[PDB]
Structure formats: structure tokens, C-alpha cells
Design a protein around this ligand. Sequence first.
Ligand SMILES: O=C(CCCC[C@@H]1SC[C@@H]2NC(=O)N[C@@H]21)NCCNCc1cc2c(cn1)OCCC2
Ligand SMILES: O=C(CCCC[C@@H]1SC[C@@H]2NC(=O)N[C@@H]21)NCCNCc1cc2c(cn1)OCCC2
Ligand SMILES: O=C(CCCC[C@@H]1SC[C@@H]2NC(=O)N[C@@H]21)NCCNCc1cc2c(cn1)OCCC2
Ligand SMILES: O=C(CCCC[C@@H]1SC[C@@H]2NC(=O)N[C@@H]21)NCCNCc1cc2c(cn1)OCCC2
Ligand SMILES: [Br-]
Ligand SMILES: [Br-]
Ligand SMILES: [Br-]
Ligand SMILES: [Br-]
Ligand SMILES: [Cl-]
Ligand SMILES: [Mn+2]
Ligand SMILES: [Mn+2]
Ligand SMILES: [Mn+2]
Ligand SMILES: [Mn+2]
Lengths: 122, 122, 123, 124
Amino acid sequence: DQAGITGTWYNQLGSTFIVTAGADGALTGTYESAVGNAESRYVLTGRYDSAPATDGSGTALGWTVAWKNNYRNAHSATTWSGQYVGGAEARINTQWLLTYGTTEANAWMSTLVGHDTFTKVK
Amino acid sequence: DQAGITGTWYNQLGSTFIVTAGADGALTGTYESAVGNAESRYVLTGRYDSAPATDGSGTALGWTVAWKNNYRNAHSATTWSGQYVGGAEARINTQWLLTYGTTEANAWMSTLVGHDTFTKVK
Amino acid sequence: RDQAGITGTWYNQLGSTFIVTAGADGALTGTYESAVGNAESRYVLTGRYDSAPATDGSGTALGWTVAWKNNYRNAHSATTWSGQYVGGAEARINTQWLLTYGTTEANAWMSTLVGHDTFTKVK
Amino acid sequence: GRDQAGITGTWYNQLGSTFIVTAGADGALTGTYESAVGNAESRYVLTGRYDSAPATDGSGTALGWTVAWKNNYRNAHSATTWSGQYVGGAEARINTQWLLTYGTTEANAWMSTLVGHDTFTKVK
Ligand SMILES: O=C(CCCC[C@@H]1SC[C@@H]2NC(=O)N[C@@H]21)NCCNCc1cc2c(cn1)OCCC2
Ligand SMILES: O=C(CCCC[C@@H]1SC[C@@H]2NC(=O)N[C@@H]21)NCCNCc1cc2c(cn1)OCCC2
Ligand SMILES: O=C(CCCC[C@@H]1SC[C@@H]2NC(=O)N[C@@H]21)NCCNCc1cc2c(cn1)OCCC2
Ligand SMILES: O=C(CCCC[C@@H]1SC[C@@H]2NC(=O)N[C@@H]21)NCCNCc1cc2c(cn1)OCCC2
Ligand SMILES: [Br-]
Ligand SMILES: [Br-]
Ligand SMILES: [Br-]
Ligand SMILES: [Br-]
Ligand SMILES: [Cl-]
Ligand SMILES: [Mn+2]
Ligand SMILES: [Mn+2]
Ligand SMILES: [Mn+2]
Ligand SMILES: [Mn+2]
């Protein structure tokens, strides 16, 4: 699985997800969002299942982007939770949560939920 | 900031969240869950907003546990998204997604959602 | 307004059947037939939509609840879908859903699934 | 219905919002919702369902309901759905996660839904 997951992915919004997987269970790389308060690439870090089930089940993985880089700071972070699905139509299917910083009065409105699909198709 | 986040946190389930924060925004550490297909400590990694807003809002952050250990492999990953609230009694408020590896037929049932609040006292 | 647009029979990606009638002032009523899970046949659904939506190209907010009891079985669970109706050439209802099942207190942490369903008038 | 009388009544969550509901013997939830925060004033219609024959075996009673945020004063072009369980006992509780969706353009649909969680008890 380490082969398939490593590389460059794109989601349904046009965002670019560059990731290296290491055989211990680590995800590293960068994220460029096509939408939102975001410009250029952002450090991403995460983990995946190093020894996944060989019966057809996807490989569970997740990663986090804190939306601060050398250009702008959106005071938020997104975590993607999902699974990688091999086969020729190699896909990474996620649900995500995006939290931005708030006062305590506004905390009830701090988190967005959504879902992305990535493939390696430019 | 890093002094504030770094340390040992416990959520409402009794889980143990050991995290180190770097100047760059990095999060690293170990997570011990008191419930679930989990045993002993799992590797975690994430990110946090290195330079939060100046209006008294919380610090955005998130992290991912892949639930493979030397002892247990639950074929799942959890991502936590939320914010660090500093003050006399510091708090991390989060929402999390837990995805487990499925076939494509059962993908619709692959992701639990919940909310965790971590404090510095058990 | 979108009363007629929403009203009808809709199908999601799973193959579930969503039969809904939208009333004059924002009521949703009808039945849901899941193609998956611990479910047989039609279940009662109720919901609300925004009966006076913006007209600035934005979707129409809605949501509804199914409890997974009918006369054939009881899955001790409810799902809520929250979403928007998008009109036009091919109408679509785009949703995210929360499925909660009964649990003890110490198992509450694992009570709720989340997912996304897209309904069209096809398949 | 089992918990048809416990569920029924006037609840409050952690934000101070007010949840006034009536359960029917076979599953229906009807009532009004008055949010303490957000783009809302006064009461909004709500409808939902609950499991009227719950396992009387440790488990909570699964339920869910919806508010569209339009009434005679405001229209916030959004809807919230709560799903969760009623837990009876000495402190009856309703613990929920919620999804709030608001009308968006197609290019902005990605940002259309907030998730959160509300705890209701029958004490102001
Ligand atoms: O936009 C970003 C950066 C990343 C977005 C990209 C996601 S990540 C998941 C998805 N997938 C993908 O590729 N891109 C997208 N941070 C803004 C969050 N919001 C701050 C805020 C504050 C207030 C508001 C509203 N909002 O109103 C109330 C007052 C204050
Ligand atoms: O248990 C875990 C990881 C432990 C983390 C606990 C969370 S993490 C968030 C929260 N916060 C905290 O501290 N602990 C808790 N992985 C197993 C997930 N379940 C897989 C599965 C498969 C099937 C099912 C049901 N489930 O039924 C259908 C058939 C297949
Ligand atoms: O299956 C159903 C009813 C139908 C749902 C259809 C959804 S609704 C959203 C989506 N959209 C669509 O059309 N159909 C799907 N209720 C689940 C009850 N499960 C109880 C339970 C206990 C344990 C488990 C796992 N489960 O493991 C962990 C431990 C114990
Ligand atoms: O607020 C409401 C209704 C009241 C909700 C009360 C909730 S209900 C759940 C919770 N529980 C509880 O008691 N009160 C709270 N409608 C706002 C819809 N949003 C419009 C919008 C558009 C854009 C934004 C941001 N917002 O970003 C900027 C760009 C576009
Ligand atoms: Br923003
Ligand atoms: Br499990
Ligand atoms: Br089941
Ligand atoms: Br608003
Ligand atoms: Cl106001
Ligand atoms: Mn808002
Ligand atoms: Mn189930
Ligand atoms: Mn599980
Ligand atoms: Mn936003």
C-alpha cells in the first residue's frame, strides 16, 4: 500500500494533495486548497494503517492541515478522516472537519463538516 | 502556544492524550484510549495554528491516530479537529471522525463522529 | 416556490428511495426506504424545508428525520439528513446525515455515524 | 409510547436555547425551537421522530428533529437537524450532534454545513 498512497492527489474541488507514506504509518507532505482562505501549499501531517486488511477493505488514514504558511494564516485547521481504495480507480475517500478559532461565545459555530474524494487524475 | 498545548491531557472518557508541540506548528505524541478496539499507546501527529488571532479566540488544531500498535490493529484512524482554549483552566474542545476500512458496499457505514473535550486534570 | 420541485420520488447513490411531499409553509412528510442497513420496507419521515429561499443562485435548505421503526422491524436508531435542494436541469438534493442508535451511557461515544447522500430523480 | 411522557416537555441546551416538544405514541416529534444564538429570534417549527419502542435494556432512545430557520420574523436560509438519544433516569438528558446547512451556491457547497453537539436537560 505504501506505493499507491504516496504521490499527488486532487479532490473534487481541484485541491492538490502531495503526500509521502512511510512504512511505519506516517503521512507527510503539502496541501494546496483550491478554495477558502488559502494560498499556496500548507504542511500536512498524518497517519495511516501500515498493515491493512487484504480482504478488500480500504486502508484507514487521516491527516491534518493547519492553515498557516508563509503567505496567510486562516486560524483554522482541517482533519480528513477516511480510507484509501486500491484498484485501477485508485481513490481516497474522506470526510473532513474544519475548525477555526472562536471566542467561547461563538464556539458553537466553530466547526464545518464535509467530504472530499481524491484521485491521482490531474 | 507550545507551552500551553504540550503536556498530558485527559478527555471525558478517561482517554489519555500525550502531545508535544513545536514552534513550527507541529504536533507529535501518543494517544491512549480508554474505550474502543484500542490497547496501550498509539502514535499521533497533527498541526496547530502557530500564531493565533489576537481577539482572544482559541487556537485551531487537529491530529490523527492510526489505530495500529505492536499489540492491536483496529484497521481504523481517528482525526480530531478543535481548538485550544487557554486560561486558568485550559481546555481542548474537539470533534472527531473515526473511519474504519470497509469494502465499497459498506462504505456508507464507515465513519463515526463524536466530540471530545480534553483537560489537564483527569 | 420549490414546493413542487422538492415533492416527488428521489433516489440516492445507495439505491434508497426517498418519497417526500413538501407542504405550503415548509413541512416535509413522506417515507424512506433504505437499500442498506437494518431496515425493511418504508419508514415514516418528517422534516422542514425553507419555503422562502434566497433567489441568488443558492440552494434551498432542508432536513428530515427517519426513526428506523415501522411494522416490520425496529433498529433502535434514527437518521437525520441536513442538506440543500438544488433546482434546475437535473435537480439534486445534497445531504450530510447523522445516524444515532440507542446505547448505554458508557457506549455513548460510539453512537453516531456520519455520511453524505446525494439524491436525484434517477436510478 | 415508552418515553412518550419523558421526552415530552420543555428542554434547554448548553447555549440557553429552548426546545419545546410533544411526542406521539407511535414516533412523531412536534413542537417549537427558540435558539439562543445565531440568526434567529422567537420560535421556529420543528418536527422529528423518535424510537417509540426502545430496548428497555440499557440503551438510550434514538431520536432526531429538524428546524428550518424561517418564521414570521426572520429567514436565515438554513436548517438544523439534531440526532441523538434520550437518556432517562434521575436526570433525563437529550444528547445530540447536529448538522446546520445553509443555502449556498454550487461553488460554495463545500462550506455549507456546520456540525456540533447540544446537550438538553429539563432544567432552565
Ligand atoms: O478557509 C479556510 C482555509 C481552508 C479551507 C479549505 C477546506 S479544507 C476542506 C475542504 N476541502 C478542500 O480541499 N478545501 C476545503 N479557513 C476559514 C474557515 N472559516 C473561518 C470563518 C470565520 C468566521 C465565519 C466563517 N468562517 O463567519 C462567522 C464569523 C467568523
Ligand atoms: O475502536 C477503534 C479505535 C479506538 C478509538 C476510540 C475513539 S477515538 C474517539 C473517541 N475519543 C477517545 O478517546 N476514544 C474514542 N476502531 C474500531 C472501530 N470500529 C470498527 C467497526 C467495524 C464494524 C462495526 C463497528 N465498528 O459494525 C459494523 C461491522 C464492522
Ligand atoms: O441500519 C440501521 C437502519 C438503516 C440505516 C440506513 C442509513 S441512513 C443513512 C444512509 N443513507 C441510506 O439511505 N441508508 C443509510 N441502523 C443501525 C443500527 N445499528 C446498531 C449497531 C450497534 C453496534 C454496532 C453497529 N450498529 O457496532 C458497534 C457496536 C454495536
Ligand atoms: O444561524 C442560523 C440559524 C440559527 C441556528 C442556531 C444553531 S442551531 C445548532 C446550534 N444549536 C443551537 O441551539 N443554536 C445553534 N443560520 C445561519 C446560516 N448560516 C449562513 C452563513 C453563510 C455564510 C457564512 C456563515 N453563515 O460564512 C460566510 C459566507 C457564507
Ligand atoms: Br473564512
Ligand atoms: Br468496533
Ligand atoms: Br446492524
Ligand atoms: Br450567520
Ligand atoms: Cl441580531
Ligand atoms: Mn454562520
Ligand atoms: Mn450499524
Ligand atoms: Mn465501531
Ligand atoms: Mn468558514
